[PDB]
């Protein structure tokens, strides 16, 4: 049979889409990522085999920390707790580590402390339209389709800075769930040039041999 | 009735447009197409028959002769050029035929104006 070629088995795979770092002594030590499927070329190409898609989101966060240089005679930092806030489309957005947006009750947030299983949250299909669009032949800027907004993710240290700086890096894992696809399209042939548009530089149809006959 | 009398290897498309009385004659293929029209493909059919409608001032009978009155027109346009193979003449001719189609009637016999 061909169970492995179904849409669910083709797209329901976790993948690292974003990677960022943030320290705890900068006022700007927070990581942000607008949720978009165009960040990774491999995932973008697989999703762009279709025109309209409908799926849920499963996010897994792999957070690790590293001790930064200090002058303290002795450093004995306790276990670190991290906050991962999901801002739904239209929600308030932070600009500093100390900002009201971090305390918005309608911005769901996960508080996770190091040493445990990585945190995981799921976001459903949150578009006012009936499906996401990977291609839009029109204007809102050509081919934007603001109906594809999926929200933003923010990450920061919860603990106050101790006697030494701590730098943390977060790996976001992205997995579409219960995917439905419509209107097949030809696979992308030219290399992706910009994340925002479909612009391309003309390339050959395929690789070339010496002559039509063997 | 319009009969295409070109070669059997000639192909093309003609737009036959009918302008109702009051409405002006079309000035372009586009204007003709936007009105009442029939696309005539000579490559598929050699003859096309149109039955223009009565349309009169709720008069049932109207004057045979007339005076600067809404007339109504029929016109023909080149939808495409005439496509022809080698060794076939591109210049052709069309014949037009007329006749009464629906319930035609006349009234008040008179003298014909064609005799001296």
């Amino acid at each position: 049979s061909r169970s492995e070629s179904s849409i669910e088995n083709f797209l329901c795979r976790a993948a690292c889409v974003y990677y960022a770092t943030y320290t705890n002594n900068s006022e700007k030590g927070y990581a942000e990522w607008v949720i978009n499927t165009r960040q990774v070329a491999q995932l973008r190409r697989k999703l762009e085999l279709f025109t309209y898609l409908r799926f849920d989101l499963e996010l897994t966060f792999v957070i690790t920390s590293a001790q930064q240089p200090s002058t303290a005679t002795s450093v004995d930092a306790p276990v670190q707790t991290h906050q991962i806030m999901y801002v739904p489309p239209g929600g308030p957005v932070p600009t500093k580590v100390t900002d009201y947006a971090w305390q918005t009750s309608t911005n769901p947030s996960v508080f996770w402390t190091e040493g445990n299983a990585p945190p995981r949250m799921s976001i459903p299909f949150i578009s006012i339209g009936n499906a996401y669009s990977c291609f839009y032949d029109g204007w809102t800027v050509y081919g934007i389709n603001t109906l594809n907004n999926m929200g933003t993710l923010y990450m920061r240290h919860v603990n106050e800075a101790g006697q030494g700086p701590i730098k943390s890096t977060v790996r976001i894992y992205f997995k579409p769930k219960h995917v439905k696809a419509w209107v097949p399209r030809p696979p992308r042939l030219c290399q992706y040039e910009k994340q925002k548009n479909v612009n391309f530089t003309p390339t050959g149809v395929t690789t070339t041999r010496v002559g039509i006959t063997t | 009735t319009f009969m295409f009398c070109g070669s059997a290897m000639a192909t093309g498309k003609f737009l036959l447009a009918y302008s109702p009385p009051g409405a002006g004659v079309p000035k372009n293929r586009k204007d003709a197409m936007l009105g009442t029209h029939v696309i005539w493909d000579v490559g598929l059919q050699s003859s096309c028959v149109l039955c223009v409608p009565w349309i009169s001032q709720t008069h049932y009978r109207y004057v045979v002769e007339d005076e600067y009155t809404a007339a109504g027109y029929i016109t023909c346009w080149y939808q495409t050029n005439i496509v022809v193979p080698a060794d076939v003449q591109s210049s052709c001719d069309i014949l037009c035929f007329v006749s009464a189609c629906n319930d035609f009637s006349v009234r008040m016999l008179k003298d014909t104006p064609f005799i001296r």
Partner: protein, 239 residues
Amino acid sequence: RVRSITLGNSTITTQECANVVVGYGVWPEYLKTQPDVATCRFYTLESVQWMKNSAGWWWKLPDALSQMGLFGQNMQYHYLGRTGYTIHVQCNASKFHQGCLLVVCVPEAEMGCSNLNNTPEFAELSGGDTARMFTDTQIGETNSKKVQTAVWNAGMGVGVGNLTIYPHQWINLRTNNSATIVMPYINSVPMDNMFRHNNLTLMIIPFVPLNYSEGSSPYVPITVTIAPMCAEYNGLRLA
């Protein structure tokens, strides 16, 4: 045998045994607010001249019928609408002409720009009733807001030979000369603004170039006839 089809005050003739390609197995239907049936008339656009050096032509759907009678009138009148289409493509060629055409209707045919940083302008993306032509050469990057019209990428950065995934019909001059594609309404929303979004793009690309001997007609006209199907718009009255 010849079959005559009359729609409204317009009539066209087609070969009785012509094959019709239904887009995705779905016929145009009504949304399961205000429909219009005076729009149900064939709109025969201006014919284009297929030549030896022709690279291809394309028409964005809503836009192509933006200056045609009540359909255009409804487009400027109502803010929102939805409709299907029935597209007839016919070539007038003799048996002494050879060539193959691909007639494909691409939903949401978003096109790239010659300048990688910008996006194409509306003029270059659509000419309304006028056709937009592909190019067998590559548009230079200097140009700021033009469509990258290289045929082998079809202006979408894909293999042109893979366009057959979208509802299509081949026109092989030695075998057939007409194509009929029935396209349903395809969108992520039930209704949309017709002036800012082109749902469909019709493409005609010659895979085998037109060839003929000296003496034959140096061109082959291609006629596109579009009939909107099951069109309906938003209401304008109170409740």
